[PDB]
């Protein structure tokens, strides 16, 4: 017997988010948690285009803590930049006012130096934006049925049973990994699939972890959209890298009885093939239903805007840095207690960007409004994965890590692959962001940005 697949509640659209502790059990022992109205993870909030909804966030923690849109094109007022700290028994409310294509975003905390461990201890929620385009297609669209969020983390525990979370010198260099693998926060659940076509609506929600989604049978996975939303027309792919943070919507066929499983494959991450990812892990199991749902694959999904002329536009040249001392140190400690399979394939400010680590209230520069620029991130220098995610936009992909982006990474992106070679891409910020509600920039290995890998960007007309 496997746990049934958890559904987060689509909240449809005034919204009360109540920022709490609660416990979860995990194998047989239970564990502190942290959750948006809930023990864990959040709910999925759904935006419609053009409709503005007031989101009360109340935080029943007793830390501090903030909360980032991600993906989401709105002023720099509403993370708050920061102005953004809500104190522990505080409230915060912002308004959205969603002016972009239908996509699946998500929310999470995002407070420097404690990012990895707000995420880890639960929290995180989904935004679903819909607009009027995507609701002609006929998409497998029964929330929870044939349209089915899977957020995908690990973690690991302590003896107690507790979340065994650190930012030491070894998580501060390779990342915080964990041996347990969930999926909407359960352990390898099953979801009960009609027969036809299946949407999954996947985010790699892990601290650290890359991810490669595939089938145990091999079967194609169609992807339909990227972080920002849909791609012109289907692509069908194999196997599915996803970086930290970043979503992709793919359509799956279920074409008969047999149950198969959603799986990921090893990757060539440090530290991230350690078993049991040195191997195919199982992520859930698809049980075939003998009823019939009618969502489609459409031959066209929807259009996208050509790239313009590069001529004239802004550069922007972003250096990522880690410390050497912390390489060293922290791959010695990888190499010291996990052996050769670590590589198949003060310490609170070491890693940087153009040489510095983020400072909150001194932004980097000032980003044009309205105006495309190239911005061009380089991580050559060291071999460590620094998926790059840019606040405000979604961008379009012109290099990524010194190759064309891949067709179903060529649409609309808020994260840009960044390992030991050089990204660029294109991109435009509709929405003001003055310096007391900065945009930011950051790798979103969890750890890396909490030691400092962060900038601070405005945006002015
Ligand atoms: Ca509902």
């Given at each position: 017997e496997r746990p049934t697949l958890p559904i987060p509640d689509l909240l449809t659209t005034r919204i009360q988010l109540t920022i709490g502790a609660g416990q979860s059990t995990f194998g047989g022992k239970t564990a502190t948690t942290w959750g948006y109205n809930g023990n864990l993870l959040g709910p999925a909030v759904k935006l419609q285009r053009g409709k503005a909804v007031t989101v009360d966030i109340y935080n029943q923690l007793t830390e501090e803590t903030t909360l980032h849109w991600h993906g989401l094109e709105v002023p720099g007022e509403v993370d708050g930049g920061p102005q953004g700290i809500i104190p522990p028994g505080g409230k915060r409310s912002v308004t959205l006012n969603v002016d972009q294509p239908?996509?699946?975003?998500?929310?999470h905390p995002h407070q420097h130096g404690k990012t990895g461990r707000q995420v880890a201890m639960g929290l995180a929620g989904l935004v679903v934006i819909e607009d009027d385009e995507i609701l002609k297609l006929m998409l497998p669209k029964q929330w929870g049925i044939d349209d089915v969020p899977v957020i995908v983390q690990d973690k690991k525990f302590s003896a107690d049973g507790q979340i065994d979370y650190q930012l030491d010198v070894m998580t501060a260099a390779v990342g915080w990994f964990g041996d347990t693998l969930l999926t909407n926060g359960a352990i390898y659940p099953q979801h009960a699939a009609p027969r036809g076509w299946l949407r999954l609506r996947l985010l790699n929600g892990c601290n650290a972890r890359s991810l490669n989604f595939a089938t145990s049978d091999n079967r194609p996975l169609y992807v339909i959209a990227s972080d920002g939303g849909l791609?012109?027309?289907?692509?069908?792919?194999?196997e599915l890298p996803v970086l930290?943070?970043?979503?992709?919507?793919?359509l799956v066929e279920?074409?008969?009885?047999?149950?198969?499983?959603?799986?990921?494959?090893?990757?060539?991450?440090?530290?991230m093939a350690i078993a049991p990812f040195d191997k195919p892990h199982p992520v859930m199991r698809i049980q075939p239903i003998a009823i019939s749902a009618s969502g489609a694959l459409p031959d066209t999904l929807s259009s996208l805007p050509a790239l313009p002329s590069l001529e004239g536009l802004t550069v922007r040249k972003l250096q990522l840095s880690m410390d050497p001392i912390l390489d060293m140190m922290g791959m010695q400690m990888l190499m010291e207690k996990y052996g050769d399979q670590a590589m198949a394939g003060d310490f609170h400010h070491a890693n940087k960007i153009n040489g510095q680590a983020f400072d909150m209230n001194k932004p980097?520069?000032?980003?044009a409004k309205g105006q495309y620029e190239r911005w061009v991130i380089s991580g050559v220098g060291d071999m460590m994965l620094h998926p790059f995610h840019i606040h405000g936009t979604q961008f379009r992909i012109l290099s990524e890590n010194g190759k064309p982006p891949a067709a179903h990474?060529?649409?609309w992106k808020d994260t840009v692959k960044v390992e030991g070679n050089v990204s660029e891409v294109l991109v435009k910020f509709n929405h003001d962001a003055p310096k007391e509600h900065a945009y930011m920039a950051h790798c979103?290995?969890?750890?890396?940005?909490?030691?400092?890998?962060?900038?601070?960007?405005?945006?002015?007309?």
């Open positions: 239908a996509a699946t975003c998500w929310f791609l012109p027309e289907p692509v069908k792919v194999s930290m943070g970043e979503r992709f919507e793919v279920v074409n008969d009885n047999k149950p198969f499983d959603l799986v990921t494959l090893p990757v060539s991450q440090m530290g980097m520069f000032a980003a990474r060529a649409g979103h290995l969890l750890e890396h940005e909490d030691t400092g890998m962060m900038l601070g960007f405005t945006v002015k007309d």
